């Protein structure tokens, strides 16, 4: 009978809500009211990167904090050198519709996808010297919204078929499949220890998955609309999700509930991309009002604004050393802020 | 030391990007949308994952993309198609059951914040099926406004009334709220659809340039 399962499911939901309320003895704002405000963080566009012909949806910094690969919808993955602004590589893609990209931790490989529903892995360390498609990972039924390398061999990718997939690049097949999401999975982020990862989807739910098992360890609710962005806290025990309800939301895994919501009345526009600084005190979030906001992760005060873009900011990422922030946009220009 | 080689590599990459820029600006991108019953498959097959078609008309290249490999949900990947010169929108004018679905989808595309600048080239296929249906299912049962509607085809004028009513519904959605709609009455077997897309894109780009050069 479906009705009894419905009753059991809503009873379990009420039990989870009651447990979260019982453990909600305080709030992050009340505890962090005594720490000094971060002040006004004025970030200037130290370097602006141009040659992308169409709007940029994807961007990922390298681990060396110098090279970054960015994907534009003209069918181009440009690997830059933000120190010198030189285009290290310009890979032409088979499918012009690219919605994600990744730079491997070793940096020998990059990845991409979008509507083609295929994760194209390209080799940047070819013996010949040119960049060619190392692999084409297919089985996704929908558009590939995000992809992140676990290492040279493994890659976890979220797609619009409401599932994620951990692939072995060498074999080219799904080592693991992650299902329970109800809507399109628009963004994921690997943990610092690269053991668990959170995926945000269009059903206003962020699911913390475990890689070695393949089952949803935790589910986080509180968002009001589609979650377009997600990133771990640098310590790995929390994450911030940006959504279409024009509010970011910081959740904690161990507490298993909302910690804080970052919003303002003047903001009525969705968040496209979210990242944390090296220490995690600043939550940089790109909005649709063509500007980004540097929220205080512990106070929620809008602690700066990055208003150098005249179109939608769709991707946003901070270097592993925290020396700079790249915020690609639909202008077709990246901008390295610092 | 290695800075010079990096500069030469950047120079080569920018030359390739300039060539790609000329190619990209030369061709015009189109987003073909419809439903399962809608005859967009025949349209894209006429001038022949994502089903792509390149067709050259009056030496202008048009790249039309039919995104059939995704799910029924399209509130996110549709944002991929704001750089398209136009959204080809295929509708079964002869299928009244699913015509309201087409109207809702057209309204959503029209009012989507990232598709506010994108003209919609509306192809009302199955005008022959619509004709035989009208001569033979009453549009009024699914559209009471048609009961009090007057015309603004050769076999009978009721077919004209029905097809222009559907056109007027779509144009009402278009005009009720920087981008225009270009409805067309096309049959399943027509060779002029490529020319229709050419003329509509000519008008769209003309209006874009007129806004650019400040005549509008």
């Amino acid at each position: 009978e479906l009705d009894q399962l419905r009753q059991e499911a809503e009873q379990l939901k009420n039990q989870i809500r009651d447990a979260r309320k019982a453990c909600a003895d305080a709030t992050l704002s009340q505890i962090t009211n005594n720490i000094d405000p971060v002040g006004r963080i004025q970030m200037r566009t130290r370097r602006t990167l141009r040659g992308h012909l169409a709007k940029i949806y994807a961007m990922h910094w390298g681990t060396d904090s110098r090279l970054l690969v960015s994907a534009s919808q003209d069918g181009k993955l440009i690997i830059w050198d933000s120190y010198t602004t030189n285009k290290v590589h310009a890979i032409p893609l088979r499918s012009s519709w690219v919605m994600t990209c990744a730079y491997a931790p070793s940096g020998n490989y990059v990845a991409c996808g979008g509507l083609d529903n295929i994760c194209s892995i390209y080799n940047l360390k070819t013996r010949e010297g040119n960049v060619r498609v190392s692999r084409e990972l297919a089985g996704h039924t929908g558009y590939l919204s995000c992809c992140r390398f676990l290492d040279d061999n493994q890659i976890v990718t979220s797609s619009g078929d409401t599932t994620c997939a951990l692939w072995d690049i060498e074999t080219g097949q799904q080592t693991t499949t992650f299902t329970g999401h109800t809507g399109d999975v628009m963004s994921l982020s690997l943990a610092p220890d690269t053991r668990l990862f959170v995926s945000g989807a269009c059903d206003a739910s962020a699911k913390l998955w475990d890689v070695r098992e393949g089952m949803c360890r935790q589910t986080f609710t509180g968002h009001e609309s589609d979650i377009n962005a997600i990133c771990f806290f640098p310590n790995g025990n929390a994450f911030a999700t940006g959504s279409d309800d024009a509010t970011c939301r910081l959740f904690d895994l161990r507490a298993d509930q909302e910690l804080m919501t970052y919003s303002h009345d003047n903001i009525i526009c969705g968040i496209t991309s979210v990242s944390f600084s090296k220490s995690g005190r600043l939550l940089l979030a790109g909005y649709d009002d063509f500007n980004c906001n540097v929220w205080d992760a512990l106070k929620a005060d809008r602690a700066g604004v990055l208003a150098g873009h005249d179109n939608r900011v769709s991707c946003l990422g901070v270097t592993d050393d925290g020396m700079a922030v790249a915020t690609g946009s639909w202008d077709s220009f990246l901008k390295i802020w610092n | 030391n290695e800075e010079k080689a990096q500069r030469e590599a950047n120079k080569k990459i920018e030359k390739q990007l300039q060539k790609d820029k000329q190619v990209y600006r030369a061709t015009h991108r189109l987003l073909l949308l419809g439903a399962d019953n809608s005859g967009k498959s025949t349209i894209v097959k006429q001038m022949r994952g994502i089903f792509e078609t390149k067709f050259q008309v009056d030496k202008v290249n048009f790249h039309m993309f039919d995104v059939g490999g995704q799910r029924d949900e399209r509130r996110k990947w549709i944002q991929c198609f704001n750089d398209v010169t136009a959204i080809i929108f295929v509708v079964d004018s002869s299928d009244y059951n699913r015509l309201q679905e087409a109207l809702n989808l057209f309204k959503s595309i029209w009012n989507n914040r990232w598709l506010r600048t994108i003209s919609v080239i509306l192809f009302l296929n199955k005008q022959d099926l619509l004709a035989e249906k009208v001569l033979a299912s009453k549009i009024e049962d699914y559209f009471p406004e048609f009961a009090r509607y007057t015309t603004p085809p050769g076999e009978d004028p009721r077919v004209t009334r029905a097809k222009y009513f559907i056109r007027d519904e779509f144009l009402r959605i278009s005009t009720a709220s920087r981008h225009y709609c270009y409805p067309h009455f096309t049959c399943a077997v027509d060779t002029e659809n490529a020319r229709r897309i050419f003329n509509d894109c000519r008008d769209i780009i003309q209006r874009m340039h007129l806004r650019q050069y400040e005549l509008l």
Partner: nanobody
Amino acid sequence: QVQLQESGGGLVQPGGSLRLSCAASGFTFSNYKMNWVRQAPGKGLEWVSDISQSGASISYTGSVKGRFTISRDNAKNTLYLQMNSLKPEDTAVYYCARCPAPFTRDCFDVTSTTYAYRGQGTQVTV
């Protein structure tokens, strides 16, 4: 979490009246364009009506104009569909979809098979 509990559906004779009320929890009601949709037996999702944020703009499918009345109470945080002179063809499971994002006036994917922001629905039969 975005949750929508419909109620009111049950047996009602042809030509009768029936009130469907959806209680919405987990989101700011005033900022979303609220939709009523239906799925008949052996048929796909069919959009019935929608009402804007403030209730000023209201629209219905042509098959129910002059028969169905969609309204919203933001203060009480609920949606209503007053269904008058029911026909045999009006039998369906009625869901209360929601605009995917605010403050947009475009209701994408409301009639999708697996739309997330939709109540589980109430059966209505005559």
